[PDB]
């Protein structure tokens, strides 16, 4: 997994530099994952949310 | 809306089989982080082309650093803004070392003098003014005269302690 990671990240970096080099723009994949933190307490909340 | 950086934002409409390769549009946006800058990109694009970010994508976002961050320049600033009772265009001048430095004083100045918060202003153009005396505005021309010097009368030093055993002076 250390390798997987290390080379995915590196890959993306070089992708970008190559596009630049070709006069193109690399556009990154949209994020497949998020972390969400609830920051409002628990009173007065509308049913749907 | 803070300590400003300036970004190139480049975006486009999503590809269709009908139009792969749709045209690319760029804006220079002043904002403090890139989440704001892309927001701002879409806010303007939506007022200028049919596109919502749901039909478009951002292709590139890149910070543009000041080229000569210690040459002093005089900048022309063009601004559109809302007052409590209408909306106005306005040309002002700012003397500074970087666009990013200029723009930030623009925002403080719109706040001080016209009570314009950030939501209410659009930066229309910002430009180094090439030839001195294309400078139009007194309060910047004043600084452009030859062998300019001035004193700073009445100097107040801040004191580190609450009592002082001598009556201070303002002498500079």
């Amino acid at each position: 997994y250390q390798k997987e990671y290390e080379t995915a990240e590196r890959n993306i970096i070089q992708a970008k530099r190559d596009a630049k080099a070709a006069g193109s723009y690399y556009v990154e994949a949209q994020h497949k994952l998020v972390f969400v933190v609830r920051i409002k307490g628990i009173n007065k909340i509308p049913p749907k949310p | 809306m803070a300590h400003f950086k300036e970004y190139q934002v480049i975006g486009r409409r999503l590809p269709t089989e009908s139009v792969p390769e749709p045209k690319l549009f760029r804006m220079r946006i002043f904002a403090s982080n890139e989440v704001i800058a892309k927001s701002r990109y879409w806010y303007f694009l939506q007022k200028l082309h049919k596109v919502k970010k749901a039909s478009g994508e951002i292709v590139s976002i890149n910070q543009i650093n000041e080229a000569h961050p210690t040459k002093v320049k005089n900048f022309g600033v063009w601004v559109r803004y809302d007052s409590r009772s209408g909306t106005h265009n306005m040309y002002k001048e700012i003397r500074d070392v970087s666009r990013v430095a200029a723009v930030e004083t623009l925002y403080q100045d719109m706040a001080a003098r016209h009570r314009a918060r950030f939501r209410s202003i659009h930066i229309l153009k910002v430009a180094e003014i090439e030839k001195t005396a294309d400078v139009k505005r007194q309060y910047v021309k004043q600084f452009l005269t030859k062998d300019l010097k001035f004193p700073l009368p009445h100097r107040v030093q801040k004191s580190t302690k609450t009592f002082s055993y001598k009556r201070p002076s303002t002498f500079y």
Binding site: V34, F35, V37, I39 | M1, N33, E34, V35
Partner: protein, 48 residues
């Protein structure tokens, strides 16, 4: 299945603060709430 096996993470309040005068506006508007994108790491790290 993996994610569900993980109980909800119980974070503390952020150590160092929220960095804005008011949480209940959007991150775009001066802060907390909504997608702050990459900047979630800094926030979660101070909460963790």
């Amino acid at each position: 299945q993996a994610n569900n096996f993980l109980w909800p993470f119980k974070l503390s309040n952020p150590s160092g603060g929220w960095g804005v005068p008011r949480k209940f506006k959007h991150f775009i508007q001066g802060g907390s709430f909504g997608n702050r994108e990459e900047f979630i790491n800094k926030l979660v790290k101070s909460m963790n």
